[PDB]
Write a protein that holds these residues in place. Structure first.
Motif, PDB file in Angstrom:
ATOM      1  N   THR A  41     -33.504  -8.541  10.349  1.00 56.65           N
ATOM      2  CA  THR A  41     -32.436  -9.283  11.069  1.00 56.65           C
ATOM      3  C   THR A  41     -32.278  -8.765  12.522  1.00 56.65           C
ATOM      4  O   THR A  41     -31.644  -9.469  13.340  1.00 56.65           O
TER       5      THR A  41
ATOM      6  N   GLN B  11     -34.980  -4.539   2.396  1.00 52.25           N
ATOM      7  CA  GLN B  11     -33.572  -4.083   2.499  1.00 52.25           C
ATOM      8  C   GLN B  11     -32.762  -5.234   3.097  1.00 52.25           C
ATOM      9  O   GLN B  11     -33.022  -5.601   4.251  1.00 52.25           O
ATOM     10  N   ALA B  12     -31.830  -5.783   2.318  1.00 50.23           N
ATOM     11  CA  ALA B  12     -31.041  -6.990   2.653  1.00 50.23           C
ATOM     12  C   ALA B  12     -29.796  -6.571   3.430  1.00 50.23           C
ATOM     13  O   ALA B  12     -28.905  -5.969   2.797  1.00 50.23           O
TER      14      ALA B  12
ATOM     15  N   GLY C 178     -27.243  -8.148   3.964  1.00 48.06           N
ATOM     16  CA  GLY C 178     -26.165  -8.519   3.027  1.00 48.06           C
ATOM     17  C   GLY C 178     -25.063  -9.279   3.737  1.00 48.06           C
ATOM     18  O   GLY C 178     -24.363  -8.637   4.530  1.00 48.06           O
TER      19      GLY C 178
END
Length: 301
Positions: free
Chosen positions: A169, A192-193, A195
């Motif tokens: 992101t 790895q999100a 979130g």
């Protein structure tokens, strides 16, 4: 008057910044007393990063594998240690420029100053907030790892962030100075999100109160609302709930302007349901959630 994105003076933190080299990897360290704190991933090769066993990698290291530089002076490493995800290097010289400081862990919605550094030198200071999803929207480039986030309370520096990684992101993850990551994130090259994020309600309201003090009051209405009435609107638009604690916190700005906290919640309710109607608040067509009530009170009183 005026209301601006404002950082703490960076001087006392500048004096603590050093360059840490393990083999082919260079990033920033914080030098307090005779300990240098940096991300432990400094001991990882590109390969290692896919699946690091930090215990085995650090067992295999010697004090000589660590090169620490305060300007162009080498600081002899005489001890090395891990605490969670931070490496602690014991050096032979106490930092004379060490200030009064503490290690604090912050919550989502709290703001702090970042001194982005490269090769142990300072590039710039900016302000940001811990997101609800335990990331920060920083401005970081390669070699920025080990840069720190902080607040200054009188003479005392409260270190609350060390930069470890950028997620796909393009937002930022790191640890407190005890090496405990904010959020579910790990110093492993994995999926790895970030979130899904949300907006910081108590902060947006703080920003509206600022708007008011600087003469911007078009969004003020006669309507009103209950807390439970507010939060039902909030959840719809991915805003965080507002609690009596948040209400209390806003108390002084409310006192300052005479505008009841829940009346402001009625202004905000309207803006979420109707939109700004082609308008701007402090020039923005968007509502600003990275100013705390503290940050507003500091600048606007």
């Amino acid at each position: 008057s005026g209301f601006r994105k404002m950082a703490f003076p960076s001087g006392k933190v500048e004096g603590c910044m050093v360059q840490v080299t393990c083999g082919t990897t260079t990033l920033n360290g914080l030098w307090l007393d005779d300990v240098v704190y940096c991300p432990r991933h400094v001991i990882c090769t590109s390969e290692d990063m896919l699946n690091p066993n930090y215990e085995d990698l650090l067992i295999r290291k010697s004090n000589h594998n660590f090169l620490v530089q305060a300007g162009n002076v080498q600081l002899r490493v005489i001890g090395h240690s891990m605490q969670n995800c931070v490496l602690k290097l014991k050096v032979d010289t106490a930092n004379p420029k060490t200030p009064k400081y503490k290690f604090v862990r912050i919550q989502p919605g709290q703001t702090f100053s970042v001194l982005a550094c490269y090769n142990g030198s300072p590039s710039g200071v900016y302000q940001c907030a811990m997101r609800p999803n335990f990331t920060i929207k920083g401005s970081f480039l390669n070699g920025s790892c080990g840069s720190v986030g902080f607040n200054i309370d009188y003479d005392c520096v409260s270190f609350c962030y060390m930069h470890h990684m950028e997620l796909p992101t393009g937002v930022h993850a790191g640890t407190d100075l005890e090496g405990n990551f904010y959020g579910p994130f790990v110093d492993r090259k994995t999926a790895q999100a970030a979130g899904t994020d949300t907006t910081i309600t108590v902060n947006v309201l703080a920003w509206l109160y600022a708007a008011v003090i600087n003469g911007d009051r078009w969004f003020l209405n006669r309507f009103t609302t209950t807390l439970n009435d507010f939060n039902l609107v909030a959840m719809k638009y991915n805003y965080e709930p507002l609690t009596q604690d948040h209400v209390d916190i806003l108390g002084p700005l409310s006192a300052q302007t005479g505008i009841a906290v829940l009346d402001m919640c009625a202004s905000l309710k309207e803006l979420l349901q109707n939109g700004m109607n082609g308008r701007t608040i402090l020039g923005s067509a968007l509502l600003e959630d990275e100013f705390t009530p503290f940050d507003v009170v500091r600048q606007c009183s």
